[PDB]
């Protein structure tokens, strides 16, 4: 160790030291003065910023690969270590101040944690191959797949903790990981594959079966095509034209008409999501505004949905099956956040995934021609299937559910692990994690069109069965109305870090988590706060008082 004061500029610059991975190169080790708050970020304390890369190499596609990291260690340190999760197919290196999600302004660094981030083992500015669908092109390299699946977060966690020990002269007392989406998958993977890396984990909207997302995507694309109107430049139906924003709002209003009050309170929120799934069928549901059937009896009017539309969304929500009827992913919850109107602005946060923007002459859904479909083809199918960007939608339209779904379990050539092997995080063996004191908070918006909230619930049910008493270390918070990680007519904003630290360090399990709406105009109000309830509980109004105030609600079993 350098004979210099700990936690100082001197100790920072001396990191540019033996690393757990001999192939670690530090490119930056710089002292940063305290930064004031901005409109979008809390103030950052004085700190050491360390950035570099691990395992620089050349892939079998001829491209350069490395695991980049950025670490920030505050001079005034609370003894805790924090890693933030990724997003999408990763490939970018964030500012690494420790995002906590939930629409929060504060970062973990602003709360005096040491914080770290990674790009997951590839770089969107370098591994952008125009012959292999752009920034998903890292899928052409077998090791870059393993790095994306698990290896990068492992290497960066070890490197960050080694830097922390050198800079401060002691290890962190407790370590925390927070991620949403791909980041939620990472958090579940860590609890399963690397249980001693983190003591507290928050996994939001976790893509723990991400290789199956493109299977759902082909299925929702083919389900919706009969309701499409018009064609894109490649002659493929415009899936975005299958439902206007007004059409989706009608569907959302019919869901509310059937389902809103099944929790006891008409408030634009379906808290009793299980009762909703048992009750709602758009082929038989009424439009509550006039009592007529939601499904048109004759020609299409602005107050009804065509039979073709109703068949299409019903099929899409049912989930993919093979020709023998076996489910290949899961079903999706009917929920009011499939739409929403705030002022004159329709919610886009559900429809962007399977349909895309209505006002476009091209397909732009994530699952039709977008990043999710591209990622399935190049990253999760084995062997990879690179192709022109203009062929992706056609490939989804021609997807064969007896043949193509098998490719996420296959190996081939140098791809010696399947994508479900390296990217899936489906194990419920959390004994090692639980026994060392680990705590996990899962959350998921009911109107998430990327990953099914009901599939997260099914994982949690399997966890509870495998490990009796699981609510002692792992709880799931479902959020009615919320879309993918944020947005929608629900209480989508919350501070998950504060209850996580309370659970890990004071044993105080979260019996509720306070939340508020980022867009309370969806309900025509200035603010709405509600408790998030641990599965299977839901929020129950006490029977009087302002329905927009959390104090008038409690968590309870459904009616
Ligand atoms: Ca309600």
3-state secondary structure 171-186: CCCEEEEEEECHHHHH
How far is it, in rounded angstroms, from Cα 504 to Cα 252?
A: 39
Where in the sequence numbering do the catalytic residues fall? 181, 448, 484
Residues 447/481, Cβ–Cβ less than 8 Å: yes
Bridge pairing between strands 174-180 and 200-204: parallel
425 phi, psi to nearest 5 deg? -135, 70
Residues 387/263, Cβ–Cβ less than 8 Å: no
Binding site as annotated, residues for Ca(2+):
260, 263, 265, 267, 269
Cα–Cα separations (whole angstroms), residue 152 to 41, 84, 123, 156, 329: 27, 13, 13, 6, 27
CA of 273 to the centre of ligand 1 (A): 10
How far is it, in rounded angstroms, from Cα 152 to Cα 150?
A: 6
Bridge pairing between strands 64-74 and 341-342: unpaired
Residues 202/101, Cβ–Cβ less than 8 Å: yes
How far is it, in rounded angstroms, from Cα 481 to Cα 492?
A: 8
CA of 390 to the centre of ligand 1 (A): 44
Burial class (CB in 10 A: 0-12, 13-18, 19+), 449: buried
Two tokens at 246? 């007004």
Packing angle, helices 152-168 and 182-193, rounded to 10: 80
What SS3 state is found at 237? strand
CA of 543 to the centre of ligand 1 (A): 12
Residues 388/377, Cβ–Cβ less than 8 Å: no
CA of 270 to the centre of ligand 1 (A): 5
Query: What resolution in angstroms, rounded to 1 decimal?
Result: 1.7
Q: Kindly report whether the peptide bond that precedes residue 302 is cis, defined as omega within 30 degrees of 0.
A: no
Two tokens at 424? 């899936």
CA of 277 to the centre of ligand 1 (A): 14
Two tokens at 201? 């984990």
Residues 97/116, Cβ–Cβ less than 8 Å: no
**Closest by CA position to 126, among listed 142, 111, 141:** 141
How far is it, in rounded angstroms, from Cα 65 to Cα 63?
A: 7
Binding site as annotated, residues:
88, 182, 260, 263, 265, 267, 269, 367, 372, 484
74-84: burial string, b at 16+ Cβ within 10 Å, e else? bbebbebbbbb
Expressed as residue numbers, the domain containing 361 is: 1-559
Which helix (H) or strand (E) element contains residue 72? strand 64-74
CA of 265 to the centre of ligand 1 (A): 4
What SS3 state is found at 191? helix
CA of 33 to the centre of ligand 1 (A): 49
How far is it, in rounded angstroms, from Cα 123 to Cα 194?
A: 24
**Per the structure, how many domains does the chain have?**
1
Q: What letter does residue 150 receive in the DSSP assignment? A: I
Which helix (H) or strand (E) element contains residue 203? strand 200-204
Binding site as annotated, residues for 4-[(2-hydroxyethoxy)carbonyl]benzoate:
88, 182, 367, 372, 484
Two tokens at 325? 């009827």
CB atoms closer than 10 angstroms to residue 411 = 14
Which helix (H) or strand (E) element contains residue 515? strand 513-516
Two tokens at 202? 């928050």
Experimental technique: X-ray
């Amino acid at each position: 160790p350098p004979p210099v004061p700990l936690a100082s500029r001197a100790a920072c610059e001396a990191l540019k030291m033996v690393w757990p991975n001999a192939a670690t190169v530090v490119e930056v080790a710089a002292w940063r003065d305290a930064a004031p708050a901005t409109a979008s970020a809390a103030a950052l304390p004085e700190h050491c910023e360390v950035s570099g890369a691990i395992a620089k190499r050349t892939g079998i596609d001829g491209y350069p690969y490395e695991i980049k990291f950025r670490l920030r260690m505050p001079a005034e340190w609370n003894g805790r270590f924090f890693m933030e999760g990724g997003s999408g197919t990763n490939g970018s290196l964030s500012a690494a101040t420790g995002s906590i999600g939930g629409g929060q302004i504060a970062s973990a660094l602003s709360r005096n944690f040491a914080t770290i981030a990674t790009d997951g083992g590839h770089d969107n500015a370098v591994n952008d191959n125009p012959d292999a669908l752009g920034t998903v092109a890292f899928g052409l390299d077998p090791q870059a797949r393993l790095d994306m699946g698990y290896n990068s977060y492992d290497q960066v966690t070890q490197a960050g903790k080694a830097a922390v020990a050198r800079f401060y002269g002691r290890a962190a007392d407790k370590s925390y990981f927070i991620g949403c989406s791909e980041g939620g998958r990472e958090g579940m993977m860590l609890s399963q594959r690397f249980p001693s890396h983190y003591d507290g984990i928050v996994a939001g909207a976790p893509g723990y079966q991400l290789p199956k997302a493109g299977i759902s995507g082909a299925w929702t694309t083919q389900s919706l095509a009969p309701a499409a109107v018009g064609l894109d430049a490649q002659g493929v139906p415009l899936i975005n034209k299958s439902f206007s924003d007004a059409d989706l709002h009608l569907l959302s209003q019919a869901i509310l008409g059937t389902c809103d009050a099944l929790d006891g309170l008409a408030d634009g929120i379906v808290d009793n999501y299980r009762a909703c799934q048992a009750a709602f069928d758009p082929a038989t549901a009424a439009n509550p505004a006039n009592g007529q059937a939601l499904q048109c009896v004759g020609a299409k009017t602005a107050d009804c949905l065509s039979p073709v539309q109703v068949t299409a969304i019903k099929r899409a929500m049912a989930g993919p099956v093979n020709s023998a009827g076996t489910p290949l992913y899961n079903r999706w919850a009917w929920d009011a956040g499939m739409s929403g109107l705030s002022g004159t602005t329709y919610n886009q946060g559900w429809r962007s995934w399977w349909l895309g923007s209505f006002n476009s002459s091209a397909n732009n859904a994530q699952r039709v021609s977008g990043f999710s479909a591209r990622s399935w083809l190049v990253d999760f199918a084995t062997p990879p299937e690179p192709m022109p960007m203009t062929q992706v939608a056609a490939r989804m339209m021609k997807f064969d559910f007896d043949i193509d779904p098998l490719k996420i379990w296959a190996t081939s050539g140098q791809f010696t692990q399947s994508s479900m092997d390296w990217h899936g995080a489906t194990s419920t063996d959390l004994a090692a994690f639980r026994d060392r004191g680990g705590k996990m908070i899962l959350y998921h918006g009911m109107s998430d069109a990327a990953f099914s909230a009901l599939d997260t619930a099914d994982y949690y049910e399997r966890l509870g069965a495998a490990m009796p008493g699981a609510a002692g270390f792992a709880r799931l918070f479902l959020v009615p109305g919320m879309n993918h990680c944020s947005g929608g007519p629900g209480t989508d904003r919350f501070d998950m870090l504060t209850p996580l630290v309370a659970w890990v360090e004071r044993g105080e399990a979260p019996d509720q988590i306070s939340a508020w709406s980022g867009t309370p105009g969806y309900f025509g109000v200035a603010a709405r706060t509600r408790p998030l309830c641990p599965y299977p509980q839901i929020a129950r109004y006490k029977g009087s008082g302002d329905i927009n105030t959390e104090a008038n609600f409690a968590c309870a079993a459904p009616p």
